[PDB]
Recover the amino acids of this structure.
């Protein structure tokens, strides 16, 4: 039909050209239709409109997550019979801050030592390898696996990590699996945490699941601990693995920038911020439901309708960023949207910045690292909410 269906099938790092077309049209908010459900939706692609949307308290994120809300995702992101309301459950139980406490600057100081040491250890192992090696399987996977165990879930086994990663990949998709496969992925993840969350939270370490289980308050429910574990998987696993893979690709495609960072390590934090702007992650959009009839940049939104913002489209808006499709670590542009904006700004932003910085520094210290094939030959997992290549073949 003549209404665009969403998402735009841009599973690689090449953003759908449709985002720039909509940005340049005469509509600040464009009506689209969810491919997976047929639900009507609104879509924002301009930075200035996105700021107005995401800072407006009359637009609710949680309302756009509830069962029956118009939605881009083909299946509800919750096991049948569960609330899928983890942040609110923690607030209700009195755990207003445990997320911020386990992911904020103090947590970063507790974890940044081993995170940087592991990034260096992993890269040093690759520096001893022959021929071609896979940065996805032999850098991103061990690093993100350590992150998830040590900061989020506890000492998982390899079978448990793979099960949870498979659940995330299967449920957090627009296509490439059946409806029942996706639902069962949320079911399997839920039943894993009903079975094992107490034990995982009891292992040594300072992981968030333990902090949540041991926090002050009645005591936290079994269902409640499962919701918390599910949240940490969906929010921290595919995001970290996808972003680190994508960031590595960006760096490999910009050897001049890497050479500069090798010569000027003090410039690495600015490079991290430019990676968060330039490197695309989600193939969908952040979204909010209007809690009352309202207007944004002249467009009337009725209560109950859901407005999406593509963070990728906003990060590539030439009204905000001069030469927005250039990777420019020295950029002094406005704040990027890689972590969102406003109330729901990524609570893990400090820890993510920590792991991205350790990755950038590991690459920058070792000149000669290159993609072993052309970027057009990288294979991408089709339909994931959070883009991720199947492998990153690399050489010295
Ligand atoms: C490079 C890595 C990451 C990126 C780019 C990223 C990005 C984002 C973005 C854009 C949002 C906003 C969603 C919205 O506005 O609706 C968000 C929310 C969130 N992030 Fe991150 N994230 C990353 C890693 C992590 C990690 C490691 C965790 C650890 C658990 C985490 C936890 C969360 C949570 C719980 C939320 C939901 C907050 C809410 O809805 O109020 N993120 N993230
Ligand atoms: O905390 C949230 N914020 C927003 C945006 C968001 C942040 N990170 C994401 C990763 C994937 C999709 C959306 C988000 C949301 O839409 N949903 C939950 C997470 C969630 C989704 N399905 C669940 C099942 C059980 C427990 C938690 C969740
Ligand atoms: O692809 C998605 N992204 C998040 C928001 C987001 C955008 N960029 C992000 C980056 C990290 C975490 C979340 C996001 C979201 O709300 N979704 C609902 C169904 C599709 C799914």
């Amino acid at each position: 039909t003549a209404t665009l269906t969403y998402p735009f099938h841009d599973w690689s790092q090449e953003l759908s050209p449709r985002y720039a077309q909509l940005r340049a049209s005469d509509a600040p908010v464009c009506p689209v239709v969810s491919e997976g459900t047929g639900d009507p939706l609104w879509l924002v692609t301009r930075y200035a409109t996105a700021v107005k949307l995401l800072e407006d308290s009359r637009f609710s994120s949680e309302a756009a997550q509830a069962s029956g809300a118009p939605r881009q995702e083909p299946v509800e992101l919750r096991a049948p019979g569960t609330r899928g309301d983890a942040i609110a459950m923690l607030r209700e139980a009195g755990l207003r801050s445990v997320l911020a406490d386990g992911l904020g600057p103090r947590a970063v100081r507790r974890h940044q030592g081993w995170i940087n040491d592991l990034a260096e250890t992993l890269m040093s192992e690759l520096a001893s390898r022959e021929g071609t090696f896979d940065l996805a399987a032999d850098f991103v996977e061990p690093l993100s696996s350590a992150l998830v165990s040590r900061t989020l879930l506890g000492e998982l086994s390899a079978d448990e990590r793979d099960l949870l990663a498979h659940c995330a990949d299967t449920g957090l998709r627009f296509c490439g699996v059946t409806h029942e496969e996706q639902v069962h992925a949320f079911t399997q993840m839920h039943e894993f945490f009903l079975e094992h969350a107490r034990r995982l939270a009891g292992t040594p370490g300072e992981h968030l699941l333990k902090l949540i289980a041991e926090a002050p308050v009645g005591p936290l429910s079994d269902e409640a601990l499962a919701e918390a574990g599910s949240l940490l998987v969906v929010a921290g696993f595919p995001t970290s693995s996808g972003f680190l893979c994508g960031a590595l690709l960006t760096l490999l495609r910009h050897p001049d920038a890497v050479q500069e960072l090798h010569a000027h390590p003090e410039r690495v934090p600015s490079a991290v911020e430019e990676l968060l702007r330039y490197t695309p992650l989600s193939t969908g959009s952040v979204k909010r439901m209007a809690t009352e009839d309202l207007e944004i940049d002249g467009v009337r939104i009725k209560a109950g309708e859901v407005v999406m913002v593509s963070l990728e489209a906003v990060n590539h808006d030439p009204d905000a960023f001069e030469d927005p499709d250039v990777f420019r670590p020295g950029r002094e542009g406005p704040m990027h949207f890689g972590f969102g904006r406003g109330r729901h700004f990524c609570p893990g932003n400090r820890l993510a910045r920590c792991v991205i910085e350790a990755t950038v520094r590991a690459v920058a210290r070792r000149p000669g690292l290159r993609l072993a094939v052309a970027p057009e030959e990288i294979s991408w997992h089709e339909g994931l909410f959070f883009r991720r290549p199947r492998a990153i073949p690399a050489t010295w």
